[PDB]
mmCIF file of C-alpha atoms and ligand atoms in Angstrom:
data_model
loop_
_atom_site.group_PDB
_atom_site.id
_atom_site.type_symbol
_atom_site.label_atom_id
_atom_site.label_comp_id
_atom_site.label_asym_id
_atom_site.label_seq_id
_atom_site.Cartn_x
_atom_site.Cartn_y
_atom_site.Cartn_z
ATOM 1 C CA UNK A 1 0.000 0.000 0.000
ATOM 2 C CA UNK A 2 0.997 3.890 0.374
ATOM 3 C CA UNK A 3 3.698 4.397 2.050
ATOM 4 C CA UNK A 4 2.477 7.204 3.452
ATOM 5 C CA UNK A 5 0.126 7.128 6.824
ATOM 6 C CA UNK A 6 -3.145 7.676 6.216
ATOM 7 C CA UNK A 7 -3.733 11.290 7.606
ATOM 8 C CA UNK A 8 -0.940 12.368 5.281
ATOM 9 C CA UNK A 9 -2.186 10.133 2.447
ATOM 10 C CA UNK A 10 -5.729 12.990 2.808
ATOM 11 C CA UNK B 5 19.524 6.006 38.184
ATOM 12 C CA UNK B 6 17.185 5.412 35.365
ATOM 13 C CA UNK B 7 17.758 5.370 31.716
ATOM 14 C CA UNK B 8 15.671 6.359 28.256
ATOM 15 C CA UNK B 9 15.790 4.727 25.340
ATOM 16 C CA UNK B 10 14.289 5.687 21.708
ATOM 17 C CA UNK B 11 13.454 2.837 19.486
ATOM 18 C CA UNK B 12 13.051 2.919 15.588
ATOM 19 C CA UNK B 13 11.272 5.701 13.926
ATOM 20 C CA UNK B 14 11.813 7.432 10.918
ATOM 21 C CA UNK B 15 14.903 9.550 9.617
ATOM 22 C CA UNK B 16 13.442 9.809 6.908
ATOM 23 C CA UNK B 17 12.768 6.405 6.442
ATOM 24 C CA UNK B 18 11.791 3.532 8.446
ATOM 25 C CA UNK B 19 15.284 2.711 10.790
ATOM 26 C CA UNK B 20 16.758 -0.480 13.266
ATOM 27 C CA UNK B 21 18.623 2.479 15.346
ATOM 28 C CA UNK B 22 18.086 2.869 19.126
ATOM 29 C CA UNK B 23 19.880 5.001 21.206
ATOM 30 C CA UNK B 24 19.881 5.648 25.038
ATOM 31 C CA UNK B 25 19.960 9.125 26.977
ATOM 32 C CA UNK B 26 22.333 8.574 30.183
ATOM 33 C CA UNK B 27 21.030 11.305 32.495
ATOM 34 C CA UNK B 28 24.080 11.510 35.416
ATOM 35 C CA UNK B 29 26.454 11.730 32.307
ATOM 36 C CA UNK B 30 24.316 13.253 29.319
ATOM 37 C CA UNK B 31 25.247 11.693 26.313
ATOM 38 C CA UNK B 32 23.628 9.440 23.879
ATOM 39 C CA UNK B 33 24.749 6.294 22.656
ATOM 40 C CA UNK B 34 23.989 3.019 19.938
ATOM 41 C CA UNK B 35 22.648 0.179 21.672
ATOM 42 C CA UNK B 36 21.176 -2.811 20.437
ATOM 43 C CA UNK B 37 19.171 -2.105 17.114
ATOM 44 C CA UNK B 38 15.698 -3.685 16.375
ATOM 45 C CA UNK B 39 16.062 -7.022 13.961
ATOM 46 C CA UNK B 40 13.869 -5.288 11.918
ATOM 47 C CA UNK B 41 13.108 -1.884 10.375
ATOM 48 C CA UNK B 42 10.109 -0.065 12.610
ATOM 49 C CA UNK B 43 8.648 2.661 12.633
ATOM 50 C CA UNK B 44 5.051 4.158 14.131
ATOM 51 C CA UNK B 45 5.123 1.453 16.805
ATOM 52 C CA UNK B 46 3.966 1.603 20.080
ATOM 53 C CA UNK B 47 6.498 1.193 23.070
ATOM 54 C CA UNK B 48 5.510 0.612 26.281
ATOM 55 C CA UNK B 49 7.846 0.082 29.668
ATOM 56 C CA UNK B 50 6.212 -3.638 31.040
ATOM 57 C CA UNK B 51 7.818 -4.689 34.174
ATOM 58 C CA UNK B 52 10.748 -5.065 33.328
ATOM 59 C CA UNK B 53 11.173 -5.166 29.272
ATOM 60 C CA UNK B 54 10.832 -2.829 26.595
ATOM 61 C CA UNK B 55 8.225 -3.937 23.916
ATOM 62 C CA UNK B 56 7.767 -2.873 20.325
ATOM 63 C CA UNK B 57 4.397 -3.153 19.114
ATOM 64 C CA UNK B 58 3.447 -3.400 15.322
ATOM 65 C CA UNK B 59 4.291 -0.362 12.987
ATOM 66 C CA UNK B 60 5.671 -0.053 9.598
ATOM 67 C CA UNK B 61 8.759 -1.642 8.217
ATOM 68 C CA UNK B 62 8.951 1.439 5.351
ATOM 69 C CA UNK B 63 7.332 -0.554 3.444
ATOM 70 C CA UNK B 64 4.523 -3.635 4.983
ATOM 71 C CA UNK B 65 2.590 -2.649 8.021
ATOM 72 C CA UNK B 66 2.903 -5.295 10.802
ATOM 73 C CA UNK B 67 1.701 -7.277 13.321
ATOM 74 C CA UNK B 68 4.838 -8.538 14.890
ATOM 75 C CA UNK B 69 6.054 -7.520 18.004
ATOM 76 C CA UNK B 70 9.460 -7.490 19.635
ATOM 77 C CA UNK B 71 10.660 -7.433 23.664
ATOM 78 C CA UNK B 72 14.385 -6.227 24.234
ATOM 79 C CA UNK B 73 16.404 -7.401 27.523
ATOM 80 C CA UNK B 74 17.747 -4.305 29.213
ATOM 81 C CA UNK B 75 20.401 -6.491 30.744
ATOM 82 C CA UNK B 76 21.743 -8.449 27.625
ATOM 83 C CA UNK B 77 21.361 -6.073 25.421
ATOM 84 C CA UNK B 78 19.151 -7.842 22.928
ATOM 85 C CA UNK B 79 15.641 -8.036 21.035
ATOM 86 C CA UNK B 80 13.461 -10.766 21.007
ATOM 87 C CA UNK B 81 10.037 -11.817 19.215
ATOM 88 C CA UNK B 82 6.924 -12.878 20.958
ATOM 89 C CA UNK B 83 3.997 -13.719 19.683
ATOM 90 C CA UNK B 84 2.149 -11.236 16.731
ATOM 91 C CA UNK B 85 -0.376 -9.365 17.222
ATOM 92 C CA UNK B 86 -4.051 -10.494 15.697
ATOM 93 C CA UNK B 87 -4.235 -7.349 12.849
ATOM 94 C CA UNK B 88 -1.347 -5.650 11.558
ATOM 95 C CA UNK B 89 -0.766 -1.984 13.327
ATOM 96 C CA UNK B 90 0.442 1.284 12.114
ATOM 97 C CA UNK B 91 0.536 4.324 14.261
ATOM 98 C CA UNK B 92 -1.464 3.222 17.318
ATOM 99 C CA UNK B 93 -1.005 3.551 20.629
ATOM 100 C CA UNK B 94 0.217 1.194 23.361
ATOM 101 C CA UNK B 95 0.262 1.215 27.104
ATOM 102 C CA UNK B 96 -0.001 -1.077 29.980
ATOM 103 C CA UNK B 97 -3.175 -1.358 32.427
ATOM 104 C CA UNK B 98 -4.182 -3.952 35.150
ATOM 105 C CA UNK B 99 -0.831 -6.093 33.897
ATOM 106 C CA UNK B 100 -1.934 -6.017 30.410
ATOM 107 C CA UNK B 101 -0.881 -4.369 27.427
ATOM 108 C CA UNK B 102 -3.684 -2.916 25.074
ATOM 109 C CA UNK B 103 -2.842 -2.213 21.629
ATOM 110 C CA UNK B 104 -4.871 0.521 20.263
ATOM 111 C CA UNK B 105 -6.449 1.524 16.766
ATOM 112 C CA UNK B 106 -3.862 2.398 13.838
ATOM 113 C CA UNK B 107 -3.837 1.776 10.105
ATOM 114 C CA UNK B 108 -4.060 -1.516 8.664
ATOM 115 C CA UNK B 109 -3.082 0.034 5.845
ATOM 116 C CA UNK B 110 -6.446 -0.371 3.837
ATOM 117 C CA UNK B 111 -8.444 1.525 6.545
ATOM 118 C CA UNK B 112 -7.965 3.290 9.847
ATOM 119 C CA UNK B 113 -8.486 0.699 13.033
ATOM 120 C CA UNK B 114 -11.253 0.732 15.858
ATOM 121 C CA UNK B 115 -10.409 -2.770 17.112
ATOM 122 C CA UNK B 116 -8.463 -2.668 20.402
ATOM 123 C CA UNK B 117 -6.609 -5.974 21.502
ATOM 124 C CA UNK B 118 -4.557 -7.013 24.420
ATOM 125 C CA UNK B 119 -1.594 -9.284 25.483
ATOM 126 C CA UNK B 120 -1.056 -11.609 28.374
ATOM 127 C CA UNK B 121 2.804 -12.063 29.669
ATOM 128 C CA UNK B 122 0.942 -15.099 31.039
ATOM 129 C CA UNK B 123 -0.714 -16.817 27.890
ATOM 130 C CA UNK B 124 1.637 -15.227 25.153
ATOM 131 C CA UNK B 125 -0.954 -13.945 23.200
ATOM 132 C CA UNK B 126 -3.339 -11.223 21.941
ATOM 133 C CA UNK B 127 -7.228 -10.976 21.790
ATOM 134 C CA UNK B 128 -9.529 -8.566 20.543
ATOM 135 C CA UNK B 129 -11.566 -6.446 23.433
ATOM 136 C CA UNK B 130 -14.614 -3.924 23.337
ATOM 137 C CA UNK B 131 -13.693 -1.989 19.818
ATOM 138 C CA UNK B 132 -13.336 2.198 19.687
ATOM 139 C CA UNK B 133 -16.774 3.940 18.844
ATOM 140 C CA UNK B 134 -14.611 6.290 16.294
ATOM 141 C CA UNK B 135 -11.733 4.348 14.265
ATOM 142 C CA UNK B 136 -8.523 6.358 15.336
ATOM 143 C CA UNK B 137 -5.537 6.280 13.475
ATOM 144 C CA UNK B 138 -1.868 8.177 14.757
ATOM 145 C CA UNK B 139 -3.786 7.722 17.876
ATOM 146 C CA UNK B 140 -1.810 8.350 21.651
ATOM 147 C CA UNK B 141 -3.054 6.701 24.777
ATOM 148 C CA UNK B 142 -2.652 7.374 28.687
ATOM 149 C CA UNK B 143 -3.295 5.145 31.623
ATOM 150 C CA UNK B 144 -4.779 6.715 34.369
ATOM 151 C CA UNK B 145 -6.284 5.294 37.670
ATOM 152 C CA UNK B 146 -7.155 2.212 36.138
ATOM 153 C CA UNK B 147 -8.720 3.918 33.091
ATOM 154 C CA UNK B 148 -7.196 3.429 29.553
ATOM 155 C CA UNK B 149 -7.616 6.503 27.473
ATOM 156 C CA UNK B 150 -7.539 6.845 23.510
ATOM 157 C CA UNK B 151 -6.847 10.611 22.850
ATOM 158 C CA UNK B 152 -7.543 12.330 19.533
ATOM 159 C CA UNK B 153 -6.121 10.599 16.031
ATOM 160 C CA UNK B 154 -7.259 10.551 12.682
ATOM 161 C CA UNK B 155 -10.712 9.357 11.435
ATOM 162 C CA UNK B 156 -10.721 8.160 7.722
ATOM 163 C CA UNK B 157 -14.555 7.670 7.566
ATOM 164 C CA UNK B 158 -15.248 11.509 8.076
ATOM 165 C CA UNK B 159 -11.605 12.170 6.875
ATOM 166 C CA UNK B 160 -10.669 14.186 9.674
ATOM 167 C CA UNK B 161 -8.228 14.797 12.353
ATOM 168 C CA UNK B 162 -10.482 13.953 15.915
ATOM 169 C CA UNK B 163 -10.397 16.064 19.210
ATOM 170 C CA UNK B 164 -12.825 13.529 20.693
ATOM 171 C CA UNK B 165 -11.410 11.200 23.489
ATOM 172 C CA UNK B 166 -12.647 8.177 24.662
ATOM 173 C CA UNK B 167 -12.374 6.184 27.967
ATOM 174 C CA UNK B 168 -11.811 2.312 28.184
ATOM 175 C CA UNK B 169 -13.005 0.666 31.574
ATOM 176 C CA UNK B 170 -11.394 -3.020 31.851
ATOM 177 C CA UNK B 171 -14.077 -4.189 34.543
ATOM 178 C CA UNK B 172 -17.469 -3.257 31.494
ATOM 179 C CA UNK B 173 -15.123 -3.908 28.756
ATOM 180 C CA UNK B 174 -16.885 -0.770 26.863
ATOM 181 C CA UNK B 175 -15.790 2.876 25.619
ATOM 182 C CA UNK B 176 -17.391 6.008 26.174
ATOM 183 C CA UNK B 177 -16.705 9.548 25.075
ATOM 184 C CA UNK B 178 -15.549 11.852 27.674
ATOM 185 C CA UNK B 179 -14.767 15.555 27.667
ATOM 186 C CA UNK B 180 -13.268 16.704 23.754
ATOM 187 C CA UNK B 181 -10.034 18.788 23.612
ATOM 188 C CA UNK B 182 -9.884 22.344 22.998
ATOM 189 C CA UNK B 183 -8.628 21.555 19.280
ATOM 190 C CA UNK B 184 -8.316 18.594 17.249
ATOM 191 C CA UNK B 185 -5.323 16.566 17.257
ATOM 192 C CA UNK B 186 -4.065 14.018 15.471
ATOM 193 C CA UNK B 187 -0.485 11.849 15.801
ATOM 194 C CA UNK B 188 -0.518 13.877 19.435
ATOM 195 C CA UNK B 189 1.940 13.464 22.130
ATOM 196 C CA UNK B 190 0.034 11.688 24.922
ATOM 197 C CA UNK B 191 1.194 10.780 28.080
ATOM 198 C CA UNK B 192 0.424 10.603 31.933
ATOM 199 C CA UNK B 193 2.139 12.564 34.826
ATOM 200 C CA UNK B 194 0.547 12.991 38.663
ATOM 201 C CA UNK B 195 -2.532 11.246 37.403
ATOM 202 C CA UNK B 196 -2.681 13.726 34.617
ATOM 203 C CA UNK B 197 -3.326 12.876 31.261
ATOM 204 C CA UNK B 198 -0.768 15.642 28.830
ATOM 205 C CA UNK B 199 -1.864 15.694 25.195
ATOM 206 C CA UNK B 200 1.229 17.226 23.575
ATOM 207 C CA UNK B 201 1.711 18.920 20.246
ATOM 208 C CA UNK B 202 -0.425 16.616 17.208
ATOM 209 C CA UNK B 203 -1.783 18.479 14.255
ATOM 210 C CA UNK B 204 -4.949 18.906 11.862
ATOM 211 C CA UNK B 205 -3.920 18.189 8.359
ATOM 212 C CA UNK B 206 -0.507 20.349 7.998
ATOM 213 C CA UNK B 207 -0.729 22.423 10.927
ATOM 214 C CA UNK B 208 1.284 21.524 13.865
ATOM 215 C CA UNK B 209 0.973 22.400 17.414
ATOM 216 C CA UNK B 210 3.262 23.532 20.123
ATOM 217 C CA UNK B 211 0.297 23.774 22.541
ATOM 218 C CA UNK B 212 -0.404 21.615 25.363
ATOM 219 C CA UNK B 213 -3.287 20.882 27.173
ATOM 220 C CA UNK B 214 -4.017 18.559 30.546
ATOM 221 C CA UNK B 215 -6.838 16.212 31.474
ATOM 222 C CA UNK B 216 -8.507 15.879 34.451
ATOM 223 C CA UNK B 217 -10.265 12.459 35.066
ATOM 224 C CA UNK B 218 -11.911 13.936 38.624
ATOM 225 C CA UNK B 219 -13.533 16.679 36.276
ATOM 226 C CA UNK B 220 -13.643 15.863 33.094
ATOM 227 C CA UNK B 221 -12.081 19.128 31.752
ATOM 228 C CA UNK B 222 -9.479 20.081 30.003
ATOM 229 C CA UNK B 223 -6.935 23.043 30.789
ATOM 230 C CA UNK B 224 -4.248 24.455 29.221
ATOM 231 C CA UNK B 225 -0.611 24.494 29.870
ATOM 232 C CA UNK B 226 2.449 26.423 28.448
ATOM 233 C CA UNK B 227 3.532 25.733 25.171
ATOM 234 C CA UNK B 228 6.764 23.091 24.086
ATOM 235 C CA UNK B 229 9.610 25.053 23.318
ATOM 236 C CA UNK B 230 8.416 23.410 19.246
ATOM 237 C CA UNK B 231 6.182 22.555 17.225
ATOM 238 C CA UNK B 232 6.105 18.470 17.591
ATOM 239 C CA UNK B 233 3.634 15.914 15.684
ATOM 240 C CA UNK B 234 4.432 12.018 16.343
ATOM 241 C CA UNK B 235 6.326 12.384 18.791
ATOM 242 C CA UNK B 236 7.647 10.180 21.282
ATOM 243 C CA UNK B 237 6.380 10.694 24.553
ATOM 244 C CA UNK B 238 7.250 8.656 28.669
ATOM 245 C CA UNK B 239 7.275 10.217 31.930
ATOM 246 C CA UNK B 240 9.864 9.489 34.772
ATOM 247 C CA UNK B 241 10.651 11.497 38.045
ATOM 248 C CA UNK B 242 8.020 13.713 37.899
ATOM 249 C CA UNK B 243 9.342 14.939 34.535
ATOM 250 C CA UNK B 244 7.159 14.639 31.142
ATOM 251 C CA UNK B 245 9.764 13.870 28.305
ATOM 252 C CA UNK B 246 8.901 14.458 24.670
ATOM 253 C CA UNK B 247 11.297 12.810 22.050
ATOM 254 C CA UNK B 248 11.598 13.820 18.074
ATOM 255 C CA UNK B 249 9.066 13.945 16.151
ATOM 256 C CA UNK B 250 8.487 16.218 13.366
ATOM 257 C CA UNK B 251 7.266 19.719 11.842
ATOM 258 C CA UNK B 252 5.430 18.384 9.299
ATOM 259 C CA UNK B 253 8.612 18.949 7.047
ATOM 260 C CA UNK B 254 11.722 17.712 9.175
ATOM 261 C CA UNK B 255 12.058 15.301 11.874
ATOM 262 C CA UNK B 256 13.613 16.543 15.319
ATOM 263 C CA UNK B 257 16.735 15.423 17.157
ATOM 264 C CA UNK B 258 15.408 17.583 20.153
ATOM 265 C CA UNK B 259 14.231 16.458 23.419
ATOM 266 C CA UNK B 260 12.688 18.596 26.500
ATOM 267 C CA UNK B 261 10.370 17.854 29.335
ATOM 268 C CA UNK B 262 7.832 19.554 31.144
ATOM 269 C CA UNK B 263 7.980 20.395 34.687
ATOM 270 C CA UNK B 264 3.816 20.803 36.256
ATOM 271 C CA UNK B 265 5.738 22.571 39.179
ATOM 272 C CA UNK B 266 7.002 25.612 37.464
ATOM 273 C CA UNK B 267 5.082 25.116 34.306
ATOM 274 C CA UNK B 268 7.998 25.008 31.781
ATOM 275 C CA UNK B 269 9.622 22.888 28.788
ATOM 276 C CA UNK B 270 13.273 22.578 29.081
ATOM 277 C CA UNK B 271 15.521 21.729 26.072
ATOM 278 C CA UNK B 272 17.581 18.460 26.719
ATOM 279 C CA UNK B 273 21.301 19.718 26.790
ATOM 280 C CA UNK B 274 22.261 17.048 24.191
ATOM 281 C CA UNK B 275 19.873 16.401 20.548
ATOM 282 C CA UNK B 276 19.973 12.845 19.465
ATOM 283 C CA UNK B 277 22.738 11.877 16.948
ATOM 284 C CA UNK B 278 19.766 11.490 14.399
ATOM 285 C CA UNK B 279 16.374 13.440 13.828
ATOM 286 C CA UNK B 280 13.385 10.667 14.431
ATOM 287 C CA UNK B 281 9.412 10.901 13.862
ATOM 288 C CA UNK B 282 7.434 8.209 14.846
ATOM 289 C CA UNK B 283 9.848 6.849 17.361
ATOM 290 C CA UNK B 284 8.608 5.260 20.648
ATOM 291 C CA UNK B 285 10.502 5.572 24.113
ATOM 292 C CA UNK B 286 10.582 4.114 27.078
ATOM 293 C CA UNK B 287 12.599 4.383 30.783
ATOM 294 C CA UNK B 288 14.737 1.685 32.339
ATOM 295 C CA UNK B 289 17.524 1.229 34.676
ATOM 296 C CA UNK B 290 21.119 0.570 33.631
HETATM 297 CL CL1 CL C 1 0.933 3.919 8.827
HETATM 298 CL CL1 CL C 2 7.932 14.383 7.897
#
């Protein structure tokens, strides 16, 4: 997935 | 004579490093690193080992979890956790250690488990009414708090907080904060429960504000010396430490605690050899 976290994937 | 240690984080990537803050000498050393990349974990102190639960590996979130030995110097790997965890919160209450919300990372997390020391191994408990992702949580007097996060159903940060009793197995909302905050610094000093720093979308805080579970209000306290999101965040000797975390933009080497006597944030003499978000801590002895 995203590597990102998902409040900075908003 | 008590020692801190910071494990994992981010710098800028997920990292094995750990290093230790010696307090009667100040200086910061390498100690044993994590077998694995990790990275928005939850650390907790439990009598008397460090444990690393779930996070990201910079690139799988996990569900593994990882106890290190204060004494030898060296991590070992109980038994995983039932869902893999990304930026939840951990902490210890009634000799067991919850594991709270995070990302899974196909959708934020309202399931709460916890682990037995006794049985080696996790079960699920009453599940979060909101799903709370880069979510802190405080113990206090036998009450397990889940303060603020990040909903992805309403997409947005939360400044709701809700309270976990062990003996009804249930949550229920108690008084909201004066702002929302998400991937907040939370932790619990004179059976006060600190929300430090967090941040709504790319605003980050410096503000700090206090819970009182007698009340149920929230006051305000002075302002960290920075503006901190995902911080690292354990209290010893009266003293609230805050470790790292990051501006939205770069992640900090800087430490300071607060002291609820004067009302003040003091810079740690000595920054950590590298800047880490997303790093847990905990406090042992030597
Ligand atoms: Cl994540
Ligand atoms: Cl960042």
């Amino acid at each position: 997935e995203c590597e990102e976290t998902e409040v900075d994937q908003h | 004579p008590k020692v801190m240690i910071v494990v994992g984080g981010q710098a800028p990537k997920a990292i094995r490093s750990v290093e230790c803050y010696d307090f009667e000498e100040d200086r910061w050393d390498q100690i044993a690193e994590l077998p694995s990349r990790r990275c928005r974990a939850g650390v907790v102190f439990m009598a008397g080992h460090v444990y690393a639960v779930g996070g990201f590996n910079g690139s799988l979130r996990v569900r593994t979890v990882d106890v290190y030995d204060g004494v030898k110097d060296q991590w070992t790997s109980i038994a995983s956790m039932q869902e893999r965890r990304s930026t939840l919160g951990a902490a210890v209450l009634n000799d067991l250690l919850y594991a709270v919300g995070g990302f899974d990372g196909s959708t934020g997390l309202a399931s709460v488990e916890a682990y037995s020391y006794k049985t080696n191994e996790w079960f699920f408990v009453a599940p979060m009414n909101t799903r709370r992702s880069s979510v802190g949580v405080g113990v206090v007097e036998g009450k397990l708090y889940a303060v603020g996060g990040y909903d992805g159903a309403s997409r947005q940060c939360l400044s709701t907080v809700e309270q976990y009793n062990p003996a009804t197995n249930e949550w229920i909302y108690v008084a909201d904060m004066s702002t929302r905050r998400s991937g907040a610094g939370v932790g619990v000093l004179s059976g006060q429960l600190y929300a430090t720093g967090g941040h709504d979308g790319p605003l980050v805080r410096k503000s700090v504000e206090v819970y009182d579970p007698g009340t149920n209000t929230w006051k305000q306290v002075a302002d960290m010396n920075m503006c901190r999101r995902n911080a690292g965040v354990c209290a010893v000797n009266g003293l609230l430490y805050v470790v790292g975390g990051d501006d939205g933009s770069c992640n900090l080497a800087s430490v300071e605690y607060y002291n609820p006597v004067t009302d003040k944030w003091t810079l740690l003499p000595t920054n950590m050899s590298t800047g880490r978000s997303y790093a847990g801590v905990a406090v042992i002895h030597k």
